[PDB]
Design a protein around this ligand. Structure first.
Ligand code: HEM
Ligand code: HEM
Ligand SMILES: CNCC#Cc1cc(F)c(F)c(CCc2cc(C)cc(N)n2)c1
Ligand SMILES: CNCC#Cc1cc(F)c(F)c(CCc2cc(C)cc(N)n2)c1
Ligand SMILES: C[C@H](O)[C@H](O)[C@H]1CNc2nc(N)[nH]c(=O)c2N1
Ligand SMILES: C[C@H](O)[C@H](O)[C@H]1CNc2nc(N)[nH]c(=O)c2N1
Ligand SMILES: [Zn+2]
Lengths: 411, 411
C-alpha cells in the first residue's frame, strides 16, 4: 500500500504514496497486465459532478495552503450552489490554470514533465465560432513558436455542455503533413494522415498533392460542421534536414516542422470536460528521426538512407538499419540546432525526467509514469529511464483520448 | 470472455482466451500498473489441486484426457501425496513440464524454440560432486563446439525447504568482479558480491578482467562446495570489429553459452530449486547490456574515444554511435567463430511469428513488452508495435532469493 520503486543502475529507492490518491482505473487486474495496450478504457449527470468538483477544489485550496479556510468553504459552497442550479459550473481563471498545469503534471506517458509548471494557458472559453477558433490557434502557434525559441502553451476552448455542442479540433496535431494514396499503388507524404487528408479534400480542400504539404485546420465550434482554414505559412516554422557529415543527405528532400502541438485530446478538470484543448511544447529528437522518419507505416526512409550510405543490406545482422537510424537522428538534432529551433535529445530528456521524478517523489510523494512510453524508441538501455522502475496510475486533472470526430459527428 | 491485442504497424488483431487459464497474480490492480517492476514452505493442503491441474494439462496435450491412464495417474498421485506429503513426476511429465515452463516464460523472446529443449533428468543426484558432473555434461552438450543446443538439467525437488539443491552461481558461466581499494572495479561489476563469496570459500582468484568464476554447488541443503569448470568446456569468443582493427586491442571477449542457474522451476506444485537452463545469445544481451550498461563493463567511453566521435555534447549521439559499432562487433565475432548467436532483428521477427502461431493454436501467448523489446533500436523491431498481454501460467520459472541470504551454515 506504500510502494517502492528501485533504479537498478543507481540503487536509488523511492517510496510512492501518491498512488493512493489515484481515482480512475488502469485496465490491469491482478490476473492480467495491460501495460502495453495503447488504448485501454456520455453526458455527466448532476450527481457525479459535485464529488469531482469537490476533489479538485480540495486539492487546489491545499496547493495554495488554504485548505479548510474561509475562501475554501465559500468556493465549495458556491460551486455546490451552481451545480445544483445550472447543472454544471465554471472554473475561476486561477483554477483553470492550475488544472491545466496539473493535467500535464499527471500525464504518465510524458517524458517532458520537468517543465510542467511553466505552461502558458490561453483562456479561449469566450470563443463561439470556427473563425474565432482559428484566430485563437494562430495566436497560440505564433506564441509557442517564438521564432524558434519554443514556449509551452495550451489553448482551452469552451467545455462540453450536453455533448451536442462540442468544440473539436479535427486535426490530431495542429501541424502535420498530408498523405495521399497513389494510383501507382504506394503512398505519397505521411501515410498516417491519409484518412484525414481525404476528409479535407472530401470537404473542400484543394490539395497540392505533395510530400510535405502542411494540412489545413478543420475546426468545429459549438457542435456545428467543421470548417477549413490554412495556417499562415509564415507561422509554420519548418526545418530542412541535413547531416553534418553526409552532403547527400539534403538530396533526400526531408524537412519537418518545429512545433509539436497535440489537438485531439480531452482535458478533464474537476469533472468538467474540455474537448478542444490544443497544447504544444518542443520535440524530442527521436519523435521525428525514429518514429516519423523510420516507422514502416510512416515515411519509412531507412532503406533509402542505408543505400546512400552503401551499407551491407543483405543480412540483418550487419545492423545496417541501426547504423542508418543513428545517422538520421544525428541529422535531425543537427538541423534543428543549426536553425536555432528548440529540440532535446533523448539522453538529455530522460536525464531530466529522472531528476523530475526525484523532485516529485520528494515534494509530492510520487510520479505516475508509463515505462512503455517513457523509454525512447532507440538506445533504450543507455538512457537512465530504462533502469528506473515506474508505477503507472491515473490522477486527475488529466488528458484523455476521445473518438475521432468524424465517427461521432451528427452531420 | 475474450481479449484483443493489436499490432499498430500491421493492424493485425489477435484474440486471447488463454488468459482465462491464468491462476497466479501479476502485481497490478485496477488502480496501479506494476508492469515495469523488476521483481513483483508448502503443505499437502494445496498440493493435490496443483498436481491435478498439471496432470489434466498433461493428459490433454497427449490426447488422453479422462482416459484410464489419466484417472489411474491422478489416483496414484493422490495416494502418494497423502502418504508421503509429496509426489514424483514421471520422466514424460518432467519433460512436458520443463518445456511448458519455457513456453510460459512471458519475458523470453526466444520462445519460438520452446519445443526443442533437451531435458536432463538429474533427480538421482545426491552430492555437490554429482551436481558438478551433471553440469559439466550439460555444458558440453549444449555448447556442441559452437553449434549451441538448448538444454535444462533438473536436480531433485524441494522437500522441506531445509534440504534444497541450489546452484549459487546466477549463471553457469560468468566473469569475476573485484572491487579495488581505489573504488574502481576489475572485471564484471555485477559479480562482485558472488566473487567475494567464492574467494571466502577458498577460490584462488587470478584477478583479471575476464576470469571464469568457479561453480558453487549446494546439494541436499549442505554447505556449498567449489568446483572449477574445465577450461576446455568453456567456449569463448574474442571480440573484434569487421572494419575497425583497433577494436581487438580493447581486449574484449565473451563466453558462448548463456546458462541461467538461479531460477526455480515449478511443475504441478513441485519446486525444482536447481534447474540450470541454457540456449544461445541474442547479440544485444552482450553488446548493449553486458558491455555498455554504466553498471557493467561500461566501454562506451573508450570505444567512442577510439572512434574519435564528438564526445562533448550528448546531442552528437556519440553514445548511440559507439553502441551500434560494439553490437556489430559482437555479432561479427560470434558468426566468424561459428558460435550460435541471433541478432535482435531476427529474434523479434521470429517472436512475432511465434506469438501469432500461439494465439491460433493455443488461444494466447503471455508476453512482457518491457522485457521483449530489445534494449537498442526498439521501434525498428516489430515487437515494439505489438500489443501484448502479460499473465502467469504454470508450469513456470520463478525467481527465488539468493541462497547466501537464506542458507543455514553447517560449518
Ligand atoms: C515541452 C517539451 C515536451 C516534451 C519534450 C514532451 C515529450 C513527450 C513525448 C516524447 C511523448 C511521447 C509521445 C509519443 O511518443 O508520441 C509525450 C507524450 C505526452 N505529452 Fe509531453 N512533451 C512536452 C510537452 C508537453 C506539454 C506542454 C503537454 C501538455 C500541456 C504534454 C502532454 C503530453 C501527453 C498528455 C502525452 C501522452 C499522450 C498520450 O497518452 O498519447 N507534453 N510527451
Ligand atoms: C534459445 C535461445 C534463447 C534466446 C535467444 C533467449 C533470449 C532471452 C532474452 C534476450 C531474455 C531477456 C533476459 C535479459 O535481458 O537478461 C530471456 C529471458 C528468459 N528466458 Fe529466454 N532465451 C533463449 C532460451 C531460453 C531457454 C532454453 C529457456 C528455459 C528453458 C529460457 C527461459 C527464459 C526465462 C525464464 C526468461 C525470463 C528471465 C527473467 O524473468 O529474469 N530461455 N530470454
Ligand atoms: C497514434 N500514435 C500514438 C500517439 C500519440 C500521441 C498522443 C498524444 F496525445 C501526444 F501528446 C503525443 C506526444 C506528441 C508531443 C506533444 C507535445 C506537446 C510535445 C512533444 N514533444 N510531443 C503522442
Ligand atoms: C536484474 N536483472 C535480473 C535478471 C535476469 C535474468 C534472469 C533470468 F532468469 C534469465 F534467464 C535471463 C536471461 C539470460 C538468457 C538465458 C537464456 C537461456 C538464453 C539467453 N539468450 N539469455 C536474465
Ligand atoms: C504496442 C505499444 O504499446 C506501442 O507501440 C507503443 C509503445 N511505446 C510507445 N512509446 C511512445 N513514446 N510512443 C508510442 O507511440 C508508443 N507506442
Ligand atoms: C526497471 C525495468 O523493469 C528494468 O530495467 C528492466 C527493463 N527491461 C528489461 N528487459 C530485459 N530484456 N532485460 C532486463 O534486464 C530489463 N530490465
Ligand atoms: Zn499492469
Amino acid at each position: 500500500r506504500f510502494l517502492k520503486v528501485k533504479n537498478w543502475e543507481t540503487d536509488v529507492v523511492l517510496t510512492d504514496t501518491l498512488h493512493l490518491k489515484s481515482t480512475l482505473e488502469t485496465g490491469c487486474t491482478e490476473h492480467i497486465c495491460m501495460g502495453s495496450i495503447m488504448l485501454p478504457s456520455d453526458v455527466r449527470t448532476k450527481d457525479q459532478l459535485f464529488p469531482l468538483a469537490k476533489e479538485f477544489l480540495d486539492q487546489y485550496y491545499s496547493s495554495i495552503k488554504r485548505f479548510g479556510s474561509k475562501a475554501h468553504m465559500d468556493r465549495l459552497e458556491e460551486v455546490n450552489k451552481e451545480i445544483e442550479s445550472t447543472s454544471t459550473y465554471q472554473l475561476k481563471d486561477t483554477e483553470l490554470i492550475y488544472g491545466a498545469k496539473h493535467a500535464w503534471r499527471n500525464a504518465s506517458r510524458c517524458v517532458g514533465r520537468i517543465q510542467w509548471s511553466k505552461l502558458q494557458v490561453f483562456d479561449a472559453r469566450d470563443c463561439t465560432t470556427a473563425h474565432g477558433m482559428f484566430n485563437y490557434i494562430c495566436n497560440h502557434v505564433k506564441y509557442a513558436t517564438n521564432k524558434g525559441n519554443l514556449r509551452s502553451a495550451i489553448t482551452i476552448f469552451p467545455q462540453r455542455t450536453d455533448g451536442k455542442h462540442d468544440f473539436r479540433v479535427w486535426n490530431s496535431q495542429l501541424i502535420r503533413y498530408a498523405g495521399y494514396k497513389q494510383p501507382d499503388g504506394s503512398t505519397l507524404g505521411d501515410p498516417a494522415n491519409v484518412q484525414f487528408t481525404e476528409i479535407c479534400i472530401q470537404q473542400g480542400w484543394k490539395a497540392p498533392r505533395g510530400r510535405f504539404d502542411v494540412l489545413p485546420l478543420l475546426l468545429q465550434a459549438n457542435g456545428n460542421d467543421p470548417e477549413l482554414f490554412q495556417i499562415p505559412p509564415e507561422l509554420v516554422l519548418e526545418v530542412p534536414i541535413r547531416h553534418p557529415k553526409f552532403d547527400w543527405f539534403k538530396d533526400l528532400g526531408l524537412k519537418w516542422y518545429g512545433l509539436p502541438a497535440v489537438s485531439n485530446m480531452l482535458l478533464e478538470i474537476g469533472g468538467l470536460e474540455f474537448s478542444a484543448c490544443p497544447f504544444s511544447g518542443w520535440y524530442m529528437g527521436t519523435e521525428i528521426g525514429v518514429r516519423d522518419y523510420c516507422d514502416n507505416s510512416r515515411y519509412n526512409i531507412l532503406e533509402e538512407v542505408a543505400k546512400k550510405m552503401d551499407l551491407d543490406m543483405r543480412k540483418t545482422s550487419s545492423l545496417w538499419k541501426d547504423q542508418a537510424l543513428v545517422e538520421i537522428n544525428i541529422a535531425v538534432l543537427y538541423s534543428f540546432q543549426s536553425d536555432k529551433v528548440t529540440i532535446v535529445d533523448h539522453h538529455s530528456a530522460t536525464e531530466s525526467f529522472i531528476k523530475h521524478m526525484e523532485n516529485e517523489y520528494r515534494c509530492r510523494g510520487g510520479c505516475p509514469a508509463d515505462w512503455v512510453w517513457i523509454v525512447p524508441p532507440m538506445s533504450g538501455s543507455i538512457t537512465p529511464v530504462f533502469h528506473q522502475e515506474m508505477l503507472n496510475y491515473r490522477l486527475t486533472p488529466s488528458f484523455e483520448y476521445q473518438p475521432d470526430p468524424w465517427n461521432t459527428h451528427v452531420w
